[PDB]
Amino acid sequence: MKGILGVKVGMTRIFRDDRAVPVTVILAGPCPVVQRRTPEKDGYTAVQLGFLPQNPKRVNRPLKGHFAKAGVEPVRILREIRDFNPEGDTVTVEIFKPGERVDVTGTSKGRGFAGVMKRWNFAGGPDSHGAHKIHRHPGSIGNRKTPGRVYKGKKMAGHYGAERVTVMNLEVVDVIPEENLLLVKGAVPGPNGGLVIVRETKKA
Template structure:
C-alpha cells in the first residue's frame, strides 16, 4: 500500500494557481509545520514537536536490533591512517530522517512472507522512517495521510526497518548521524546503477573471442552455452546477455581490506560529522551513483556486531550535558590538522 501511494506522488499538475493562491498555501504550510529552515545542511522545515509523550527507553543488550537510517551517497574521499596507509571512503549524508510510525510485532505483517517457517515469527516489530521533507502539494491526499499521526511533513523517501520491541522509538523523533559510533561496522543497502541491456563482456567480464585468425563477427560473443552430453539444454543460471544494474544489493561488513595493514572491515565508520550528519565509511563498493539513496543499519554478521552499547534506541542530544564536537575521528585515522612530519634536533 505504501509503494502504491508513493508512485502516485511527484505528479505535478497545472492547477492554474495565481500568486495570491500560492502565497496563501505557503502560509498555511508554514503555520502547520513551521517556517522553512536549513538543518544539517539540508533545506527542510522546523522539526515538529512530538505529539505524544516519548516512549520509555529500553536497555541495550547483545542481540537487540536497532533501527536504521536513510542516507544519500554524496561522493568518495581519500583518507590516511596513522601508519601512512591510504584508504578510500564513501561519504553518506543522513538527510532529514524522522520516525513516521512504529508497528508492534503482533501487528506487523511483511509484504513478502518467507517460504520457510520462522522459529520466532513475532520477534521483531517495524519502524517506518522517512527522509527529506517535501511540499505536501507534490503528493496525493492518501500519501500525505501517512504522516498525520506523527505530525511531520510528508517525506520524499520511506524505509522500513526490523527492530526489537525494546528499540521502539516515538514517531516524530529525528534520527541523526550520531545514531552510529566511530569504528562500528554497518550494512548498506542500495540500488546499483542502471546500465541497460549489456553483453557478456561488460555484464559478466567475459574475455570474448579472438580478434583475428579467422574470427568473423563473434568477437564479443559468449561462445558455447551448451552443457554437453545427454543433458542437451542450457543450464539455469547460465551467464548470458541481459539487463545490467538497477538491482538492490546489500554490502555487508564481511570482507577485510587487505590493502590496509590495519585489516579494518570494509564497511567500518572512520569519521562522523555531527554538524551536517555525514558518515565516512571505508570502501568504494556502496551500490548506486552519486546522490543516490541508500539504507544504513547495524550489521547482522554475528562476529561484527557491536560489543559495546551504542546510542540506544537512538541518539538524543538532550541527554548530553555538552554538545558533541563537529567532527569525530577514529583513533587509527590521521587528522588533517595534525602534523605529518616532525623533525628533531640532532647534535
C-alpha cells in the same frame, strides 16, 4: 539491528595515522519515525523511517493522511528498518560512532543491456587467428540431444545493474553530526545522489 536512510554524496580520502583512507560521504540524518510495525499488529518488528522533506503541494491525500497520523511534515522517501525500535521519534547519524562496522545498501549503477563479457566476465572470442564475428560472443550454450535444452540460470547477455546491492562490513571512519554526515571507508553502490541505507553490520 539499527539503521538509517541517507543519500550518497561523493568520495574522498582523509588522512588518519599517516594513512590515506578512501571514504564515501553519506548524508544520513535526520529520519523521523512515521510508523512502527509491531508483532500484535503487523506480525513482525520494524520502523518505517521517512527521509528528505517534501513540497506538500506534491503529496496526495492518501499519503497526507499517513503522515498526519504520525504528526510528521511530508517527506519524500519512506523506508523500513527491521528489528529496530529506537526510543525517540527521530533517528540521526548519532546512532553510529567511529569504529563501528556497517552494511550499506544502494541501487547499483545501470549498464542497461550488457553483453556477456561486461556482465559475467566471459572471455569472448579471439581477436585474430580466424575468429569470425564472434569476438564478444559467449560460445556454446549447451550440449546436444541430451539434454537438448538450456539450463535455467544460464549466464547470458541482458540488463545489468540498477539493482539492489548491499556491501558489508564497512568501517565507520567518522561522523559529523552537526551536518548529518557519515564517513564510510571504501565504496558504496550506486551514483552520487542515490538513496542508500546504512544498517549496523551483521558480520562478527
